[PDB]
Design a protein around this ligand. Structure first.
Ligand SMILES: Nc1ncnc2c1ncn2[C@@H]1O[C@H](COP(=O)(O)OP(=O)(O)NP(=O)(O)O)[C@@H](O)[C@H]1O
Ligand SMILES: [Mg+2]
Ligand SMILES: [Mg+2]
Length: 421
C-alpha cells in the first residue's frame, strides 16, 4: 500500500516516521513533507493548500490511505474532496472539523451535551462583549471564534486587557471572519493535559495523554509559542483522571457530533484542564496535536496504519500502548516567537544518543546540511522506561546537536516530574 501524509511540520514527520514502520506499507508519501523526513517518506512537491493537486495525485498514484496532519485543510473540507474522488482518507469532513474550526460551536455543543468546560458566552457586538467583561471582571479569557493564525486567545488579567482584545477582534476585525464572533469564558487553572482519541462516529479509541510547555522561557515565563516541548505519560495525572475524561468528555463529545449530523472521523483532540472541580474542556482540536503527536505516537506499540485501516473499515481496533516514556524538547530560532530569521546553518541535527528521534518542524536541507526554516526547528525526542530517564536522555541528545541560531527550554518536564513525587 501507498500512504500519503499531508503537511510539513513535526507532527507530520512523526506520522511519516510511524507509518514507515508498518508491514503493510510499500511507499510513504509526504506532501509537501520537509527535508527532515526523507528517510521515512518520499517527498511529494504539493502544498497542503493545493487541494486539487493533492486529490489528483493521490487518485492517480494508487494511494490507499491518506492521513491529513494540519487543521486548515480539514476545516476547509479537504476530506470531503478526497472522498468525492473515492479516496480512502483519515480525518474529519468539513462538517465535523467545525468542532475545531468554530470555538463557539464547540462551546455550544458542550453546553447542549453537558460536557464540562469553562462558563462562557459568545458575542458579535463589541458593546455587549465589553459590558459582559465589566460584569464578570478579570481574569477572563477572550477567544476569536475561528482559527486566527492560532493567535485567537487572550487570557486577560485585567478588564482593560480583555476589552482591548475585544476591540481588536470585533471593532478592528483583526482576524476577519474568524474574529467576527468571540467566546468570552471563565479563566481556569490546574494541570493542563492533552487527550487524543481515534474516533469514528461513536467509536472512541483513546491514546495516552501528553502535556506541553507553551511558554517560551524556563519557569514558563515569556510569550506563548507553538510549543517548546512535551512528554507522555504525564506523571502527576492519575490513570483514574484519564479514564474519567475518556468516559465523560471524549466519548460524549464523539456521540454528540453524530447526533448533530456531523459524524466525526479522525483524531479528536481534547485539551483539558484538570481543575479542583475536575477536568474541563479548554479546547477541541480535530486532528493530531503539535507538539503532542511527537511524544504520543512513538509510545504506540500498534502499527498506526493497521489501526487507521481497521478504524475506517469498522473492524475491531487493536490499539496497544508501550509503558515507555517519551519527552521532547523544541529547538527554536533565536527571536521566536517574535521576529526570527530563516537560513541559519545548524548542522546535521543528528544525535548519537540512542532512542532519540529528531522530528523536523522547520528545517531545510541546504548544502549537505540543515538550515533553519521556521520559528520552531526540531523536536528532539527521547524515549526510555521512566519519565525521568527519558528526560535525562533528551537533554544529552539536545546538547549534542545544538547550534548557534537556536534556543530551547532546559526545564521541559521538570515541574511535572517534581509534582509527581
Ligand atoms: N479558559 C481558560 N482558562 C485558562 N487558560 C486558558 C483558557 N482557555 C485557554 N487557555 C490558555 O491559552 C492557551 C490555549 O490557547 P490555544 O490557542 O488554544 O493554544 P494551543 O495549545 O496552541 N492550541 P492549538 O493551536 O489548537 O494547538 C493555553 O496556554 C491555555 O492554557
Ligand atoms: Mg485549537
Ligand atoms: Mg487485522
Amino acid at each position: 500500500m501507498n500512504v500519503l501524509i499531508i503537511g510539513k511540520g513535526g507532527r507530520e514527520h512523526t506520522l511519516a516516521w510511524k507509518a514507515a514502520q508498518s508491514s503493510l506499507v510499500e511507499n510513504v508519501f509526504a506532501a509537501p513533507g520537509n527535508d527532515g523526513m526523507a528517510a521515512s517518506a518520499q517527498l511529494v512537491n504539493i502544498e497542503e493548500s493545493d487541494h486539487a493537486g493533492l486529490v489528483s495525485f493521490a487518485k492517480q498514484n494508487q494511494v490507499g490511505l491518506t492521513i491529513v496532519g494540519p487543521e486548515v485543510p480539514l476545516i476547509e473540507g479537504l476530506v470531503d474532496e478526497f472522498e468525492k474522488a473515492g479516496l480512502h482518507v483519515f480525518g474529519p469532513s468539513k462538517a465535523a472539523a467545525i468542532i475545531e474550526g468554530s470555538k463557539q460551536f464547540a462551546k455550544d455543543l458542550m453546553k447542549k451535551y453537558d460536557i464540562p468546560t469553562a462558563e462562557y458566552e459568545t458575542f458579535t457586538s463589541f458593546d455587549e462583549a465589553k459590558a459582559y467583561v465589566q460584569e464578570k471582571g478579570a481574569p477572563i479569557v477572550i477567544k476569536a471564534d475561528g482559527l486566527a493564525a492560532g493567535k485567537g486567545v487572550t487570557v486577560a488579567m485585567t478588564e482593560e486587557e480583555a476589552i482591548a482584545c475585544l476591540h481588536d477582534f470585533l471593532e478592528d476585525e483583526k482576524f476577519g471572519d474568524a474574529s467576527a464572533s468571540v467566546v468570552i469564558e471563565e479563566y481556569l487553572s490546574g494541570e493542563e493535559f492533552s487527550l487524543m482519541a481515534f474516533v469514528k462516529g461513536e467509536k472512541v479509541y483513546p491514546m495516552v495523554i501528553a502535556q506541553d510547555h507553551k511558554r517560551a522561557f524556563d519557569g514558563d515565563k515569556g510569550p506563548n509559542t507553538g510549543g517548546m516541548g512535551a512528554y507522555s505519560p504525564v506523571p502527576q495525572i492519575s490513570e483514574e483522571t484519564v479514564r474519567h475524561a475518556v468516559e465523560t468528555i471524549v466519548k460524549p463529545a464523539a456521540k454528540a457530533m453524530v447526533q448533530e449530523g456531523r459524524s466525526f472521523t479522525g483524531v479528536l483532540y481534547a485539551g483539558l484542564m484538570l481543575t479542583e472541580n475536575g477536568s474541563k474542556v479548554i479546547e477541541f482540536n480535530a486532528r493530531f496535536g503539535d507538539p503532542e503527536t511527537q511524544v504520543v505516537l512513538p509510545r504506540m506499540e500498534s502499527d498506526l496504519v493497521q489501526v487507521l485501516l481497521d478504524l475506517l473499515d469498522d473492524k475491531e481496533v487493536d490499539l496497544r500502548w508501550k509503558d515507555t516514556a517519551a519527552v521532547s524538547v523544541v529547538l527554536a530560532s533565536e527571536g521566536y516567537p517574535e521576529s526570527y530569521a530563516k537560513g541559519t546553518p545548524i548542522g546535521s541535527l543528528a544525535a548519537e544518543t540512542e532512542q532519540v528521534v529528531v522530528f523536523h518542524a522547520g528545517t531545510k536541507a541546504e548544502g549537505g546540511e540543515f538550515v533553519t526554516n521556521g520559528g520552531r526547528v526540531a523536536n528532539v525526542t527521547a524515549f526510555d522506561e521512566t519519565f525521568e530517564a527519558a528526560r535525562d536522555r533528551v537533554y544529552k541528545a539536545v546538547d549534542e546537536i545544538f547550534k548557534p541560531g537556536l534556543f530551547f527550554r532546559k526545564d521541559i518536564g521538570a515541574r511535572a516530574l517534581k509534582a509527581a513525587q
